[PDB]
């Protein structure tokens, strides 16, 4: 850990990060209480799929975010969402990683030889966004993208903010009165020991990520494509003084080490 980077053929390019990708998707509950959203046909054309671990919002289940999870899977990601409605410690998210790792390496299953376990990301909404930070401490994790994280309690260890392994895309909502950004997101940005891109979407509430992922679906996808798939087309969304988010009137950007 990190696990070796084992890339396959390059992933098809897409013209929009917020539209579906080329793959037909499926989901199943399997492993240690994991709901996995993935391309129906794994390894099409020789691609090796990067992994995204997902933590739900407090009291929610994977289906609450089915539109977002499937969307990522349509791009070519295998998304392992912990089934738990309380994912703040990040432990259940990582149990799902342990299962995929094992499955990839075994000779005869669904995922055998199909994953790129050297390319792992974490994300989550609210308590699960705190859970993605906590899991981002694992050396197997290359990047995190917490969506409106709740970091004031519900299993969060603020020490984890200074022990990240890769770059973070921190997302907050200007109208979130449940995981108030100044109290839950600003401290994460302040303390991050890795390059951080903090995008605050003005006006949106704590329910914006539920379902299709709303305004966070495209940006989050561009982030994972760039970090996990080396998609250079997604690069400009976050890099440069003129990156897309940077010039958008609906996002407040704060960047560091990038």
Query: What CATH number belongs to 1-258?
Result: 3.40.50.1820
**Residue 30 and residue 78 in contact, taking contact as beta carbons nearer than 8 Å:** no
Taking the C-alpha atoms of residue 75 and residue 221, their distance in angstroms, rounded to an integer, is 8
Q: How many Cβ atoms sit within 10 Å of the Cβ of residue 113?
A: 14
- Residue closest to 138 by CA, chosen among 115, 157, 161, 164: 164
Strand ranges across the sheet with 168-173: 25-30, 34-39, 78-82, 49-55, 115-126, 143-149, 168-173, 196-201, 251-256
Q: What are the counts of helices (DSSP H) followed by strands (DSSP E) for the chain?
A: 7, 9
Tokens in use for 252? 């407040």
Decide: 111 and 103 in contact? Cβ < 8 Å.
Answer: yes
Within a 13 Å sphere around the CA of 60, how many CA atoms are in the beta-carbon half? 22
* Residues sharing a CB contact under 8 Å with residue 100, sequence separation 6 or more, in sequence order: 31, 36, 51, 78, 80, 111, 115, 117
Q: Looking at the chain, list the stretches that DSSP marks H as alpha helix, in order from N- to C-terminal side.
A: 66-75, 91-105, 127-135, 181-184, 186-191, 217-229, 244-247
Q: What does the alpha-carbon distance between residue 30 and residue 21 come to, in Å, rounded to a whole number?
A: 24
Domain residue ranges of the chain, discontinuous segments joined by +: 1-258
Chain centre distance of CA 219: 11
- Chain Cα centroid distance, residue 204: 19
What are the backbone angles phi and psi of residue 245, rounded to the nearest 5°?
A: -65, -35
- Do residues 102 and 80 touch, judged by C-beta distance below 8 A? no
Phi/psi of residue 5, nearest 5 degrees: -80, 110
* Cβ atoms < 10 Å from Cβ of 28: 11
Q: Are 50 and 224 in contact (CB under 8 A)?
A: yes
Listed residue (133, 119, 228, 226) closest to 171, CA to CA? 133
Question: Beta partners for 98?
Answer: none
Cβ 234 vs Cβ 223: under 8 Å: yes
Q: What token pair was written down for 218?
A: 């495209």
In a 3-state reduction of DSSP, which class is residue 87?
Answer: coil
Cis peptide, bond prior to residue 2, ω within 30 of zero = yes
């Amino acid at each position: 850990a990190p696990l070796p980077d084992t890339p396959g053929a390059p992933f098809p390019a897409v013209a929009n990060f917020d539209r579906s990708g080329p793959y037909t998707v499926s989901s199943q509950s399997e492993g240690p209480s994991c709901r996995i959203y993935r391309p129906r046909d794994l390894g099409q054309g020789g691609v090796r799929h990067p992994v995204i671990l997902w933590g739900n919002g407090t009291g929610a289940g994977p289906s609450t975010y089915a539109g977002l999870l499937s969307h990522w899977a349509s791009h070519g990601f295998v998304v392992a969402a912990a089934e738990t409605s309380n994912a703040g410690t990040g432990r259940e998210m990582l149990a799902c990683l342990d299962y995929l790792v094992r499955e990839n390496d075994t000779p005869y299953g669904t995922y055998s030889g199909k994953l790129n376990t050297g390319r792992v990301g974490t994300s989550g909404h609210s308590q699960g966004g705190g859970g993605s930070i906590m899991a981002g401490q694992d050396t197997r994790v290359r990047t995190t993208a917490p969506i409106q994280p709740y970091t004031l309690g519900l299993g969060h260890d603020s020490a984890s903010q200074r022990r990240q392994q890769g770059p973070m895309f921190l997302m907050s909502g200007g109208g979130d009165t449940i995981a108030f950004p100044y109290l839950n997101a600003q401290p994460v940005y302040r303390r991050a020991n890795v390059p951080v891109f903090w995008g605050e979407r003005r006006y949106v509430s704590h329910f914006e990520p539920v379902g299709s992922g709303g305004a966070y679906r495209g940006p989050s996808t561009a982030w994972f494509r760039f970090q996990l798939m080396d998609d250079q087309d997604a690069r400009a969304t976050f890099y440069g003084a003129q990156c897309s988010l940077c010039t958008s009137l609906l996002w407040s950007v704060e960047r560091r080490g990038l």
